[PDB]
Structure formats: structure tokens, C-alpha cells
Write a protein that binds this ligand. Structure first.
Ligand SMILES: *[C@@H]1O[C@H](CO)[C@@H](O[C@@H]2O[C@H](CO)[C@@H](O)[C@H](O)[C@H]2NC(C)=O)[C@H](O)[C@H]1NC(C)=O
Ligand code: NAG
Ligand code: NAG
Ligand code: NAG
Ligand code: NAG
Ligand code: NAG
Ligand code: NAG
Ligand code: NAG
Lengths: 318, 174, 174, 318, 174, 318
């Protein structure tokens, strides 16, 4: 008469790693690395703004593509591929710093500068590069200033924006760089051209420069955009005689939001805290191998397909 | 193994035991039987469940993007970012690999441990009324009916009831 | 746990034993007594002391600041610094969490191991003169006065001295 | 007769975490994360310099607030909040890189440029923005060069600093940007203005720009600061005709030091190797949850209030 | 250690045994012998080899330079790079130190475990024919010549062949 | 009769660290930190390029020291110390971004701009600083454009490079900065000088500046280098009237390669995958303490001399 002690075994064992063995066989195991993502933007429970073909910079200068995104509130901003920032060709200085400021904001308010111009200034410069309602237009937050009379010298003019708020404001302006000495003379006169910007914390000078260059959207002219933050209670003064693309509105970035860059479709029926170019990730799991570029609260990225965690004893089959 | 039971002095596992992780097989005049042990099995399962909960706990840290997906990053700051993120990825896959490896060693060893702890429990139950067979079995030196076998599994077996007979049986004297 | 003794076959600890971590309780004609074991207590304590010393050994890396507290940081590089620091911070809290959980597991197991090593030491001193409770007690099959109990705790007890009397009592023969 | 084996227990057991259990009661335990700092800068054993209301950049140009910190040796440098770097309104190009150099140095030596100017030049330009001893002054290491005869063209001048030392030298200069044309013409004349700085490894050009801006410290003119390192054996040449704020002395950053930005009062009686904005951290513990911004040799920051290290066995009471 | 054998109830190691990690020494009427146990030695040796395989496996990840050796780095970006690299170095030296400490602890403990497993398999082989002396020895209560000693080491010792003689010598009676 | 169980020991033990013991003695241990490197660049198995005294940037513009290296293919690229980029003294804007770009490529192709000029323009400018075969020369990929009529105005000219390839191209140009108004008038004329470069994505402007500077290679004049990427299908236009150092050839970076900065000798007989300033590293070991600066697939740098891994049990001798 004998009584025996024993443990279970299974037919189909799983293979895990240990400190001493790379091919240890146990009764059961479970994955620690997430390999499956959701190819949709799970927006349930969050006020989001999908910018479609509007680039975040365009929200500040007011490109036609961004006409529905000039102001608003959100807790997550969605940028899409090939979004448009410029209708009239150009470039923003320190654009990546500026784009990131917007992408971590939670809303934009717009406030008027209040700028007025003398009788020798045409403040409604316009272009076929910024079409709006079947008619030539311009950036909605900026004003292309041109001599009212063709060929005539642009008047030395001064404009000062006061920040009377309790928060800092984002101010953008442009400088027009004409494609020909001809074009420059027609718009601003034959005089020497200079733009001077000064606040209590910022000062800089710009000069429109004539240059031949290829056509972009029908235009060989350029506008280079610049920006600064005006602190509350501070004034910022514009001193110019042609070439300034003046602001009619400044921006105030409100609160905090999550910036997502993806071309995945929005799904308002699922929740997620983790996003990337391909969509969302939702796991209990601590690691993932979907992408090293994520945003939000994500599992840590690892260079492994799989890392099995044993959940049973050594398998000794028979 | 560390405790020398599972994959040790125990020749192999029992595929017919789906009622638990640890158990008894007996043999007497009435025939054979098999039963799982709940206590030892739950000790092993609870510990594994505890490992899984620790694997699932999550950090609250939000991260913003520092690489534009849709526009060019300046080359030097791009290389630094590339260097940093790759450095950080290496730490994590190292950590994960280490995590799993260290955990699996401990899980395998503690399962062996629970098997040994049960065995030891039985050995001291029978005390002088049985002898170790060397392969996980105890040769009982008195008749043990299913009711008696049940008492051993149930931890109610009284050794004093069979002691006198068992000693005579072991010293081969009658 | 891992070794079956503490929170295992020993029902509970002894609040009365303020003398040491591990010890003896005895029972004879003179009554009851209690004493701590020095060697086994020191083995556990020295090991804890060792963990604390490794915990407290300090790395020598001096760090400069890369974030002005009192002036602005350019936005793009500031975001990189933020991303980096937050990543390094996540790595360290993970490591601290893992270190502590792992050390705690080992500290609890080795303490249970010192208990078991003392129990086994005593089991071997007595060899054929005593039998196991199953509860951490040895039933001694001869008379053991306070000096005899002391010889056990102090590892001088000669089993051959009491063997004849003991074997007669165990086999229940005059 | 019997002998029983056992282990101790305690009535006040603590809870710790293990690999398998989140709530494990043990006999003793100790913290591994420091939560407690010292709200003072423990400077015992260290030769330190409290800059007070002097800003590190001020040490180089010589702002009145930094008159006692123009030279020196230290192994720890303490910057305070709202420290003053500019008495006359202006900014420095690449100020953060420059501020960091100062904050990791063990001292400053000053050496004269040996710059001399003719009679047509008034080198003693002064301002009420930089008051010193109840009188109008200027930056102590610089000089505001101006036409001695009010309204006349600043002469075409050339100054050269020769580094004959064995180490590199920090040279700073300023460019004055006048608030108006009348002011400019007054100071430098009517001529076109250009400042050209050139060494063997450096060349840059500057043009003072007239512009209207708000008043700061009573001045609407600005002084933009610039700098470079002159290598030993190398000479650097200043070529100018008005608008140059010239260096009378040059800086040598000496050795190495610990930079501390803090508003915590100094205590010369306690000793430390870890500092943050709120003071010092004195710990043998490997982790701390005070600040993720520290300097010196510190415990690593963790996002945890408490991490208990079991220092005793499982507690099984009664 | 954890398992009470090596630097435990065995006083010391044998320098004379260069044949293997674990083994036997014996005394009988015909003299003395020494022999290594191959199974227990290979068990320990295989686990070591596995540790060295996992240690050496290469996980890279090619890096480019972000620090020019031969030209100037802009100061701010160079401090951010220095900060990051020292932070990463601090993590790696921590992990390497912990890796080695934890692995070493495990190595010496499993080695102690394999020793104990051998001693345990011998105890069960001799069952009622021998008794433990407390120092890692089995005092055999029957004549065990050189071929009997060999059968114990080779795991071919049949305890039923010597039981009667041995029980006689242990009880002294019958 | 007795049988005894035991384990081996050795007289000469090894000391290792454990979780509890700092001085634990074991029978055998092995090192985990590699302390030994190879004093050579192990280039076996790799199609390498040793630049010698040719600096990576010199390859693009065509410095005489780089005549053997103007094009090529490689999977690894070796830069040496004190290498030569500039024969005529000057500097490149964004030099380190450009160098890193080149040092992670697998080859360079050169393609002609096909720029042609008027007879009024001398396009074969020459200098003593760029000696090529005992005779004055210039950068092989650039042309120093000068008025053929000494003292007469350089004509307003326009050159356009058209990228007809399916990949981006690297274009470099120079701006000459004369050391004297005399020299400036002799070479380009008395007119206001201006260079404007423009593409679909890039636009910028440059103005030659006259300044007094020390002599480098005898020259007190300077040439500043600038560069950009020209996208497929895009044209880039040079609008200039003097002082433009024009590109006769354009660069094209092919694929990927490893860039190494070492002054260590080349060994074509050993293999390696990890390199540093002092040579190569060939280990199975996971950690090294030779250098925190390495390139390639490398062991992780640790701050420890030795980390011994036990490979045997405790040593208990007697
Ligand atoms: C509980 O553990 C702590 C540390 O783990 C013990 O405190 C240490 O006591 C020693 C004296 O033996 C001192 O040298 C240390 O400085 C103490 N450290 C700390 C952090 O306080 C404490 O004594 C233990 N308590 C009991 C009752 O054993
Ligand atoms: C802004 O302008 C108003 C009106 O000119 C003035 O009262 C105020 O002081 C200015 N603020 C600053 C900071 O100059
Ligand atoms: C950074 O890494 C990505 C992914 O391999 C690569 O596409 C990109 O070119 C890298 N950036 C730089 C500057 O090397
Ligand atoms: C970096 O983090 C700090 C602390 O959260 C925050 O105040 C700061 O604005 C952050 N910088 C950027 C550029 O997001
Ligand atoms: C109570 O327990 C704590 C551990 O939590 C210990 O540090 C303290 O000394 C104990 N005090 C008493 C009076 O038992
Ligand atoms: C600097 O000038 C001195 C004297 O004028 C001269 O000896 C020295 O060689 C010059 N150094 C350089 C680098 O031009
Ligand atoms: C970066 O670290 C190296 C090595 O200590 C040092 O030589 C260099 O000066 C540091 N860079 C900065 C900007 O401090
Ligand atoms: C480049 O120039 C050619 C020749 O005129 C022209 O056909 C082509 O459209 C131009 N490309 C761009 C992008 O302007």
C-alpha cells in the first residue's frame, strides 16, 4: 500500500526564457509585449479638433484652409499629413518651435490689434494665391500693405499693439520678398525699405530683398513669417515703410491639450490614452512593439516581437 | 530544480490531473485513485496572480511628440533625438528581457517549492507508519482503505491509531 | 513560503521572544523554558545589513543644470529636455519599484530559510531519540532536564548517551 | 518531554511589496525614497559666491549690481531670482549657452584690451539707466563710444585685442540701436554705419538699426550684446564707425564649479552635495521625490511617495 | 546558504576533488575512496553555461556619433548631450551592478541546492539502513565493501538486500 | 562504515559581490566589463574610405587635399584630426549638421550645374592659398566670379540649377568677404552688392561685407559657405551682382555608412563593429569602460573597472 505525490503536466507545453535557460518548457505562459494596435483615433471622452487639411500654423495667420479653425477649445489637436499652412508661398522662422507650442495648447482666442493706416496706404492687398469665395483674398489675420498709388513711396508708418490682458499673446507678422525690382517699386516705391519691431523684450529688423525664384502656387514672391510672445502690460511697436505684412489679429494659446500627428480615422466610440501615426494603443501590457514614436500615456517600446511570462510550473510531460 | 521535486525526484508530471496543480495517487487493495490538493494549488496560483497584477500596474506619465511626422527636423537635433530614443529603447528591451527571465526562474522554482512543501507535510503526517520510496511515494506499513487514504489527503490521519501495527510491520516481527 | 517553515508548518511567531529572531521553547518535568538562537539570528541580520549597505553605497556622478529656473528655455530644446528627463525618471521609478519588490521577496525567503536550517540542525542532533510533530516540535523519547535542553540549543547534546532509553520508549518495549 | 522551534513576531508589523504580494506584513522595514529636504543652501566646506541680485552675465559686462563680482575664484556659484544683467535695456545673443559657461566655472579673471580712442571720440558715454555712486555711469567692462562733437560723423576706427595668454578668452561687445534718426545722427553722424568683427576663426557684421520701441528703465534705445572666444595666439579686430559698445576688459573663465540656481538662504554649518531650487538634499537613500531638477551628486528622482525595504521576516502574530 | 549545505552543515569543501563539483568520500574495512558525482556536477555546470550564454548575447542597435571629436560642439547642445549620456551611463552601471549581484546570489544558491539534492537522493536510497551524522555523512549499519559503496554512488543500491542486518545493528536487539 | 557527501574547493579563491555580501568568495568568476581595446581601426569586411587630411566638407567644395575623394562609394568613412576643409580662409554656416550628414552616407556623386557666364565676367578666379600643382588654383566644385574689367561693376546675373534627378541634391555656394573697400571695388565694382538665392522651399540673401581681419594663409579676406538640399524636380536660382562663389558641381549623398573619428592606424586584417577615438572594440562582453563615446554596435559604457560574474559555488577551503 502506497500513496504518491505528484504535479500536473500538459501535452502542448509553452517555451519561455529563464536566467539559465533560453528554451525552458512550462505548462502555460502569457505575452508581455503588445503587438496589436487599433488603426483608428479613439476620441471617446475627449473634446477633439480634427484640422483636416489645415496646418496648425495656418490657424494663426488665417489661411483659407483653416477658416473653420481660427479659434476654439479642445483637449486634443489632430494634425493631418500634407496640411496647408501657406496659400501665398513662404516660410515661418522657428516654425517647429511654434508648431509644438500650438500642438500642446488646448484652444486659441483671437484679439484685434486695432491697427489703422494713413490715406497713402492700401491695407487690402490681395492675391489669387489665397482664393476665398471665388475672389482674391489674403491671410485672414494679416493685412498686405501696399502704396495706394502704384510706384509711389510707402509712407513711414508706426503701429503699436498693447497687451492689456493678464496673459501673454502670440503675434505674427510677415515680410514680403518681391521677385523683381519692378514689382518692389510698384508696391512700395523706389525708397530704401526697412521694418523695425520692438517690444520691451524683443527687437529685430527686416529688409525685403528682391530675388528671382521659381513659382510656387503661381507666385515667385515670398512672405517670410515671424513671431514673438508679448507679455501682459507690454507694448510692441512696428516701424515700417513697405514690406510689412501686418497683423490685424493676435493669438492667445489657452490651457493644455494633446497634439497627435496621424492619418488614422477618428472613432468616437472607443477610449484610449496612447496614440501614434498609425492610430491608438490599448493594453494592460507594459511593453509594445508597434512604434517608438508615441504620444500620451503609452506602454514602453521594445525591440522584441515577444516576451513570454511563465504562468505555470516546469512541464515534464508523459 | 532548486527544491529537487518537480523535474527532480519526481519522474514526470501527471497529464490526467486537470483538477489542480498538485495531487495524490494511491494504491491499496480496493484499487487505485487520484485526487488534487486545493491548498497547495491555490498557494501557487495566488502567487502567480500576484505577479500578473504587478505586470499590469501602469504609470501616469504623459509624453508629447518631439519628432514631427509630417515635416523635416533639423539634422543635428534630429540625430541627438535619434541617439537618445535608441539609448532609451535599449534600456527598456534589456529591462523587459531581464524582467521576464528573472520572473520565470522564480515562478518555476516556487512551484517546485509548493510541491516539496506538500510532500513534507505528508511525510510528517505518517511519521513512523510509512517509509519514503525515493520517487515521491510513501509505502504504508498497514492496511489503508480509501477512508484512510482520504484522511491523509484531508490532514486528519491519526498516526497513533496504526503505529503499533506499522512498527511490527517495519521491523519484520510478528 | 519558499521553505515551508515561517508562515508554513510553524503556526505562528512568538511575540515573547524579544531575545532574537529564532529560538527554542521546551517542556520537561521542571516545566517550560524559552531561549533564542544566536548563530541563526546573526546569519539573518548580517544578511539584512548587507542589503542595506549595498542600498546606501552612493554613486559619484555630478550633474550640471540644463534647465534655467529663472529664465526662458527655447521651446524645441526645452521639449527635448522634458521628454528626456521624463523618460529617465520613468526608468528609475520602475527600477526602484523592481529593486524593492525583488529584495523583499529574497529577504522573506532567506529568513524562512534560516528558520528551516535551525530546525534541520536540531533534527539531526537528536537523530533516533526524537520524532517530529509536524508543527516544529520534537517529541523527545527520554528524560531531558534543563541541562539536557541546554545541550541541544548549544549543540553539544550526545545522542548516543540517551539512545538506549529512547529506542525503548519509541518501540514501546521494556 | 519536547523541544519546539520558532521565530519571533511583533504587534506593530509594517506592509511591504514583493514580487507576488502587494500587501506583505513583515516585522521591520525602512524607507528607500527621501521625502525631506533642507530649505537652506548647505555651503560648509565649499568656497562659494552668492551673486545676490547680480546676474552671471552682469559679471562680464560689469553692471553696477555686479560691482563686487567682476573677478573671483569659487567652487560653487549661486544665482538668485530676478538678478540684474542689464541696467541699460538690451539682450545677449546666445545668452543661455553663455550663462551656462559661467555657471560651470571656478572663477573669472579680467584682462584689459588696451583699447585707445582719438579725440574725436568720446569714450565716456554714460546713462541714467546705469546709476553708480549717485551719478550716471555705464557697464564697467565696456565703453559707449560717441562723436565728441555732437552731430558729426564718427571716425572710421580699428581696434584689435591680442590674446597673448596660453588659454582662451571670452570677449563681449555691444551694438547700440538708437530709438530715432535724430538720436543716431547726433551720436554717430549721418553716414551709413557698419561694425565688423573678425578674428582667425570668427567674422560677423553689425548695423545699428533705428526703431521706435517702448521705454525700459527710461530708455527706448537698446544695446544688443554679442560674444566669442578668442583662442590663444589669436588676434580679434573691431572695425567700426559708430554704434559699437567696445570692451575695455576681457574675461577668462577659470577652472570648474557647481552652478546653483536657488532662492534658499545660505547655511555655512551644514554640508551637502545635492542642491535644488528649494535648497539642499542630505541623504544616504538612493532615491528622492523632492524635485526632478537637481544639481550636484544626487539621489535619483522617482514618482513615488514611499518604497519600503523589508528588514525583517514575515510577521505572523499572536 | 539558502539550502543549509554548502557553508552550512558541511564544514568545508574538498580541495582534493578536481574530478567534479560534488562527490563522495567513504570509509569501510577495506579503506577509503573518493569519487565525483557526474549528474549533480553537470546540472550545476549547465546552468552556469546558460547564464554565460544570456550574458553574451548581443542586442544592438548601431549608433552614430553625436559628439565631434575634432571640432567644437555648441555649448548648450553639448551640455544637454553630456547630461543625457551621464544619465544613461548611470542607469547602465546600476543595471550591470545589480545584474551581477543578483546573478551571483542565484549562482551560489543553486550550487548549494544541487549539493542538497545529491545528499537527499542518497538519504532516500539507503532508507532504513543508514543514519545521518549531522555533517553530511551517512553512517551505514551493515558491512559495505567497495562494490557496495560503488552501488550507492551509481544509484544501484538495493536497500532490501541489507535491511535485516542493518535493522539488527541499529536497534542492537532482535 | 560511513559515506560522506561533499563539494570541491580551491586554495586561491575569487572575490565577487552579491545582494548581501560585498566580499563573497567563490571558486571561479569571469569579467563582464571589457577593459581592453584594439589600438587599430579594424576594417576587415568593410569597404572603407580613409580621408587622410581631407575634411568631409572639403569633399563637397573641392579642397585640393580632397582631390582623391571628390566622389566615391563606401560603407564606412574615416575622418582624421586636423583635416583640411578650407584652403582659402572661411567658415560654413551649420557646419556640424552638414558634417554629420556626410558622415552617415555611403557615397558621393557629383553632378554639373552647367553654369555659364558672360565675357564681362572672369570665372577663373585663382589664389595662392589653393595651390594645385605648383600653380594658383581654387575649389574644384566652385568658381570665383570676378569682373574681367578691373574696377568695373559686376553685371547683374542669374544662374539656375535644375534638379532633374529622382533624389535630393546637396548644393554649396560661397560668399566672398573682401578685406578692403579697395579690393572690393577692384573685383566687383562700386555698386551695392547683393546675392539672393531662391528655390521652391529655400530663400535667403547675402551681402559681402568689407572688414579688417588678421591673415589666415596670408589672406585677410574670407569666404563663407552656405548649403541646402534641392528636391527632385525643383529648381534653385542664383540672383547676384558680385561676390558669389558659384557651384560648377553639385553633390549627391548615396545610401548609408558608418562615420568614424579616429587617429588610429588601419588594420585590414581584423574585424570590428564598434569603434572609438582610440581604435576598435571586439568583445562578447556586455559592458566596457574604455570610452563613453563610441560609434557602431557597442557594449554599454559603464563606470566600473571590474564586475565579476561568479561561475562557481562558494569557496570554503581547508
Ligand atoms: C528596523 O530596521 C532599521 C533599519 O532597517 C533599524 O534602524 C537602524 O538601526 C541601526 C542600529 O542597529 C542604526 O545604525 C541605523 O542607522 C538605523 N537605520 C535607520 C534607517 O533608522 C532599526 O533598529 C530596526 N528596528 C528594530 C526594532 O529592529
Ligand atoms: C504701453 O502704451 C501705453 C500708452 O502709450 C502706456 O501708457 C504704457 O505705459 C505702455 N506700456 C509699456 C510697458 O511701455
Ligand atoms: C532618425 O531616425 C529615423 C529612423 O531611422 C531616420 O529616418 C532619420 O533620418 C534619422 N534622422 C537623422 C537626422 O539621422
Ligand atoms: C517642460 O516641463 C516643465 C515642467 O512641466 C514646463 O513648465 C515647461 O513649460 C515644459 N517646456 C515645454 C517646452 O513644454
Ligand atoms: C514598532 O514597530 C516598528 C516597525 O514598524 C519599530 O520600528 C518600532 O521600534 C516598534 N516599537 C515598539 C515599541 O515595539
Ligand atoms: C597677432 O598679432 C601679433 C602682433 O601684431 C602677431 O605677432 C601674431 O602673429 C598675430 N597672430 C595672429 C593669429 O594673427
Ligand atoms: C561635455 O563633457 C566633456 C567631458 O567631460 C567636456 O570636456 C565638455 O566640456 C562638456 N561640454 C560642455 C558643453 O560642458
Ligand atoms: C525648372 O525649370 C524648368 C525649365 O524652365 C521648368 O520646366 C520646370 O518647371 C522648373 N521647375 C520648377 C519646380 O519650377
Amino acid at each position: 500500500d502506497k500513496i504518491c505525490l505528484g504535479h500536473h503536466a500538459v501535452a502542448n507545453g509553452t517555451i519561455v526564457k529563464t536566467l539559465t535557460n533560453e528554451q525552458e518548457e512550462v505548462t502555460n505562459a502569457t505575452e508581455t509585449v503588445e503587438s496589436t494596435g487599433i488603426n483608428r483615433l479613439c476620441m471617446k471622452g475627449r473634446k477633439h479638433k480634427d484640422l483636416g487639411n489645415c496646418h496648425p500654423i495656418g490657424m494663426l495667420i488665417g489661411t483659407p484652409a483653416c477658416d473653420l479653425h481660427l479659434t476654439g477649445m479642445w483637449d486634443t489637436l489632430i494634425e493631418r499629413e500634407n496640411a496647408i499652412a501657406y496659400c501665398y508661398p513662404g516660410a515661418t522662422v522657428n516654425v517647429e518651435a511654434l508648431r509644438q507650442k500650438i500642438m500642446e495648447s488646448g484652444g486659441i482666442n483671437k484679439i484685434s490689434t486695432g491697427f489703422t493706416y494713413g490715406s497713402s496706404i492700401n491695407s487690402a492687398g490681395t492675391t489669387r494665391a489665397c482664393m476665398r469665395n471665388g475672389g482674391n483674398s489674403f491671410y485672414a489675420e494679416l493685412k498686405w500693405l501696399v502704396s495706394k498709388s502704384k510706384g509711389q513711396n510707402f509712407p513711414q508708418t508706426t503701429n503699436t499693439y498693447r497687451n492689456t490682458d493678464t496673459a501673454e499673446h502670440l503675434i505674427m507678422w510677415g515680410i514680403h520678398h518681391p521677385s523683381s525690382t519692378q514689382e518692389k517699386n510698384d508696391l512700395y516705391g523706389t525708397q530704401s525699405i526697412s521694418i523695425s519691431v520692438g517690444s520691451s523684450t524683443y527687437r529685430n529688423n527686416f529688409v525685403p530683398v528682391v530675388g528671382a525664384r521659381p513659382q510656387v502656387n503661381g507666385q515667385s514672391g515670398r512672405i517670410d513669417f515671424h513671431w514673438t510672445l508679448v507679455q501682459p502690460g507690454d507694448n510692441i511697436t512696428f516701424s515700417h515703410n513697405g514690406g510689412l505684412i501686418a497683423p490685424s489679429r493676435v493669438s492667445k494659446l489657452i490651457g493644455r491639450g494633446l497634439g497627435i500627428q496621424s492619418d488614422a480615422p477618428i472613432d468616437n466610440n472607443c477610449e484610449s490614452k496612447c496614440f501614434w501615426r498609425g492610430g491608438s494603443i490599448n493594453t494592460r501590457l507594459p511593453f509594445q512593439n508597434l512604434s517608438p514614436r508615441t504620444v500620451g500615456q503609452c506602454p514602453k517600446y521594445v525591440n522584441r516581437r515577444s516576451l513570454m511570462l511563465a504562468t505555470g510550473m516546469r512541464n515534464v510531460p508523459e | 530544480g532548486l527544491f529537487g521535486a518537480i523535474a527532480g525526484f519526481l519522474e514526470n508530471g501527471w497529464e490526467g490531473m486537470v483538477d489542480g496543480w498538485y495531487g495524490f495517487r494511491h494504491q491499496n487493495a480496493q484499487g487505485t485513485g487520484q485526487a488534487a490538493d486545493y491548498k497547495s494549488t491555490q498557494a501557487a496560483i495566488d502567487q502567480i496572480t500576484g505577479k500578473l497584477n504587478r505586470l499590469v500596474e501602469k504609470t501616469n506619465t504623459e509624453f508629447e511628440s518631439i519628432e514631427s511626422e509630417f515635416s523635416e527636423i533639423e539634422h543635428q537635433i534630429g540625430n541627438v533625438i535619434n541617439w537618445t530614443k535608441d539609448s532609451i529603447t535599449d534600456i527598456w528591451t534589456y529591462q523587459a528581457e531581464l524582467l521576464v527571465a528573472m520572473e520565470n526562474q522564480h515562478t518555476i522554482d516556487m512551484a517546485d517549492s509548493e510541491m516539496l512543501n506538500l510532500y513534507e507535510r505528508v511525510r510528517k503526517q505518517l511519521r513512523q507508519n510509512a517509509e519514503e520510496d525515493g520517487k515521491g511515494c510513501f509505502e504504508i506499513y498497514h492496511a489503508c482503505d480509501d477512508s484512510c487514504m482520504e484522511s491523509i489527503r484531508n490532514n486528519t490521519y491519526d498516526h497513533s491509531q496504526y503505529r503499533e501495527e506499522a512498527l511490527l510491520n517495519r521491523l519484520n516481527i510478528n
